[PDB]
RNA sequence: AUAAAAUAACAUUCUU
C-alpha cells in the first residue's frame, strides 16, 4: 500500500501549490515556487519507477515546468537590464534546469517508463517549441504513435495535440490537403471541437493567406469560447497582427486592441507588434506607416508595462529608423527630435530608449549625435545603468573626431559606474566596448587605405588591458581580447609582440568592487 | 482533476 506513498503525497502538495502560484496574480512565495519545482523534479526520478505515477501527476509536472519557462522569461524582461552573457544569472541556469528536466521526461515517455495525457502532451510540445526545438517536436509526436501503451499514443493524437502540430506541419510541408479537409469538417460539425484545434488551423490559414477561412474559423472560436479558457482568442488575434501578410487585415486587428473593441482581455504582445512593424517595413518601405504604429504602441503601453517591453519595441523601431535615414542625418536628426518630444509626452524617458537610439546612430558617424544623446541622459533625468556608459564608449569607434583622452575618459566613467552599481569585475561587454573604440576603428581605417589604392588607438587599448587585468572576471579575457581578437582584426598582431613589456600609466580610482 | 485543465512580451551594450 506504500511503494512510494509519502513521496507521492508530497509530490501532489508542491506541484499543486506551485501550479496555483503560477496561475494566480525576494518574496517567500516566489522562493516557494522555484524550490517546489526542484523538489518536484527531485521526487520525479524516485516516483518514475512507481506504477501509481498517474499520467495526470506527470502531466501536472510538465505543466509546472512549462509555467517555469514562462516565469523565467518574465523575470528576464522585468530586470533593470539584461545580465551579461559571461556572468552567472538566474535566467540562464533556471532555463537550462527546466529544459533538461523536460528533456528527461520526454525520453522517459518515448522509452515507456512514464505515461502522459493529451493535456501533458500539449505542455511538453509547447515547451520545446518555446525552447526553439521545433524539429524535435515533430519527432516526439511521430514517435509517440509507435508506442506500446496506446493510452499515451492516443493522447498524442487528441485534437488539442493535433492543433498544436498544424502550424509546424504547414511550415515543414506547405501542405494544405489535411487543413482544407479539417476546415470542411469543422465548419459544418455540430460536435465539440477543441479550441486549440481551431487555433492551430487559423494560424495555418493566416500563413497561407486564406483569410476568409481563417476569419470564419475565428468567428466559431469566438462564439464557443469560455471565459475560463479565453487564451485561445489571444493567440489567434495576435496571429492576425504579426503573421498576416495582408497589412490591412493585420492593422484592423491591431486597432481592435488599441480601441479596446474586443469582449475578451488581450495584451499587446510586443513580439507581435515587432513582427507587424517589420512586415510593414519589408512590404511597403513606408517609415511613416511604421512610425504611426509605433506611436500607438507607445501610447498603449505608457507606464503600464515593464521597461524591457518598451526596450524591445524601440529596438525594432530605431533599427528601422536608421535603416531609413542611413544617408540623411539632417532630416533624421529633426525627425529624432519629433520622436523625442512625442516619447516625453507619453511617459518619462527610460534609458533603453536613448541606448537603442545611440547604438543604431553609429552609421551616421558623427560626433554631434553622440554628444546630443549623452546630454539628454541628464536633461531628461534618466536613471542610469552601465549599458549607456558601454555604448558611449563604443560610439567612439564610429567617429574620427575623437582623441585617446576622451577614449580613456569614457572608459574611466564606465569603471566608476561599474563600481558605483556594485559590479564585481570587468565583464566581456566592458572590454568589447573598448575594443570597438580602438582596434575595430584602426582596422577599418587600414582596410580603407588598402582598398583605396591621441596618436594611436591600439596603444591605449593594450595599455588599459594590462592596467585593469587584475580586475577582470577571468584571466582568459586577456587571450580573448588580444590573441583571439587578432584572429578577426589582424592589425593587432603588429602590436602584440611587445605586450610582455606592458608599460602602463593609466589612472584607476576604484571603490567597492 | 475529468468533451475541460487557457494565455506568457526571448529588450538596448556581449565574434572568441
Ligand atoms: Cl546596471
Amino acid at each position: 500500500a506504500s511503494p512510494w506513498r509519502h513521496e507521492l503525497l508530497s509530490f501532489d502538495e508542491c506541484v499543486s501549490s506551485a501550479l496555483k502560484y503560477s496561475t494566480t496574480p525576494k518574496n517567500p512565495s516566489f522562493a516557494m515556487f522555484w524550490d517546489s519545482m526542484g523538489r518536484a523534479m527531485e521526487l520525479y526520478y524516485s516516483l518514475r519507477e512507481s506504477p501509481d505515477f498517474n499520467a495526470y501527476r506527470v502531466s501536472r509536472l510538465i505543466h509546472l515546468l512549462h509555467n517555469g519557462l514562462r516565469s523565467t522569461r518574465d523575470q528576464l524582461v522585468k530586470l533593470s537590464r539584461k545580465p551579461d552573457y559571461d556572468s552567472q544569472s538566474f535566467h540562464k541556469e533556471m532555463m537550462n534546469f527546466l529544459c533538461n528536466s523536460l528533456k528527461d521526461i520526454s525520453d522517459d515517455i518515448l522509452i515507456g517508463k512514464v505515461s502522459v495525457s493529451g493535456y501533458g502532451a500539449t505542455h511538453l510540445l509547447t515547451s520545446f517549441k518555446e525552447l526553439s526545438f521545433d524539429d524535435d517536436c515533430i519527432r516526439i509526436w511521430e514517435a509517440s504513435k509507435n508506442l506500446s501503451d496506446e493510452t499515451t499514443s492516443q493522447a498524442f493524437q487528441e485534437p488539442k495535440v493535433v492543433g498544436f502540430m498544424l502550424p509546424l506541419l504547414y511550415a515543414k510541408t506547405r501542405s494544405l490537403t489535411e487543413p482544407n479537409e479539417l476546415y470542411n469538417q469543422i465548419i459544418q460539425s455540430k460536435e465539440f471541437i477543441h479550441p486549440n484545434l481551431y487555433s492551430g488551423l487559423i494560424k495555418v490559414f493566416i500563413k497561407a493567406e486564406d483569410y476568409e477561412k481563417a476569419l470564419s474559423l475565428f468567428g466559431q472560436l469566438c462564439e464557443k469560447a469560455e471565459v475560463r479558457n479565453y487564451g485561445y482568442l489571444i493567440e489567434t488575434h495576435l496571429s492576425f497582427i504579426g503573421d498576416s501578410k495582408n497589412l490591412t487585415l493585420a492593422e484592423s486587428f491591431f486597432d481592435k486592441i488599441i480601441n479596446d473593441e474586443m469582449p475578451y482581455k488581450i495584451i499587446l504582445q510586443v513580439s507581435t507588434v515587432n513582427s507587424f512593424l517589420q512586415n510593414i517595413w519589408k512590404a511597403q518601405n513606408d517609415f511613416d506607416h511604421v512610425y504611426r504604429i509605433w506611436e500607438k504602441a507607445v501610447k498603449f503601453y505608457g507606464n503600464t508595462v515593464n521597461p524591457g517591453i518598451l526596450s524591445s519595441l524601440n529596438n525594432t523601431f530605431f533599427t528601422i529608423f536608421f535603416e531609413n535615414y542611413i544617408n540623411d542625418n539632417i532630416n533624421g536628426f529633426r525627425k529624432l527630435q519629433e520622436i523625442i518630444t512625442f516619447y516625453s509626452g507619453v511617459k518619462k524617458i527610460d534609458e533603453p530608449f536613448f541606448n537603442v537610439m545611440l547604438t543604431r546612430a553609429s552609421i551616421w558617424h558623427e560626433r554631434s549625435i553622440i554628444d546630443f544623446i549623452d546630454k539628454n541622459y541628464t536633461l531628461y533625468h534618466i536613471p542610469r545603468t552601465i549599458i549607456s556608459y558601454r555604448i558611449l564608449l563604443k560610439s567612439l569607434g564610429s567617429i574620427d573626431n575623437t582623441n585617446n583622452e576622451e577614449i580613456l575618459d569614457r572608459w574611466l566613467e564606465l569603471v566608476k559606474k561599474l563600481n558605483e552599481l556594485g559590479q564585481q569585475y570587468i565583464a566581456n561587454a566592458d572590454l568589447s566596448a573598448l575594443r570597438d573604440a580602438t582596434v575595430v576603428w584602426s582596422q577599418s581605417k587600414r582596410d580603407e587605405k588598402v582598398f583605396s589604392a591621441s596618436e594611436d588607438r591600439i596603444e591605449l587599448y593594450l595599455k588599459i588591458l594590462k592596467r585593469y587585468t587584475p580586475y577582470f572576471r577571468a584571466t582568459k579575457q586577456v587571450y580573448r581580447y588580444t590573441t583571439g581578437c587578432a584572429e578577426s582584426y589582424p592589425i593587432l598582431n603588429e602590436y602584440l609582440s611587445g605586450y610582455s613589456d606592458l608599460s602602463a600609466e593609466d589612472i584607476p580610482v576604484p571603490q567597492l568592487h
Side-chain angles (χ1 to χ4, degrees), chain A residues 408 459-460 463-464 466-468 504 508:
Chain A
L408 179 55
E459 293 192 342
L460 177 68
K463 179 175 300 182
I464 295 178
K466 178 257 176 180
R467 187 62 192 273
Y468 286 79

Side-chain angles (χ1 to χ4, degrees), chain A residues 54-89:
Chain A
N54 321 337
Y56 171 74
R57 293 194 174 105
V58 187
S59 297
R60 295 268 278 180
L61 177 60
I62 298 178
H63 183 10
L64 177 57
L65 298 172
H66 182 196
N67 282 6
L69 298 169
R70 293 161 156 172
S71 178
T72 306
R73 296 194 301 264
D74 175 67
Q75 294 305 306
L76 195 278
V77 75
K78 281 185 172 178
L79 298 170
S80 58
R81 56 121 178 171
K82 285 175 55 179
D84 300 334
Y85 301 154
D86 62 331
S87 69
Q88 197 283 332
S89 69

Side-chain angles (χ1 to χ4, degrees), chain A residues 1-16:
Chain A
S2 297
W4 287 270
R5 170 85 82 174
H6 176 271
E7 303 187 317
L8 280 171
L9 303 179
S10 58
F11 180 88
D12 297 2
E13 292 190 0
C14 63
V15 167
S16 302

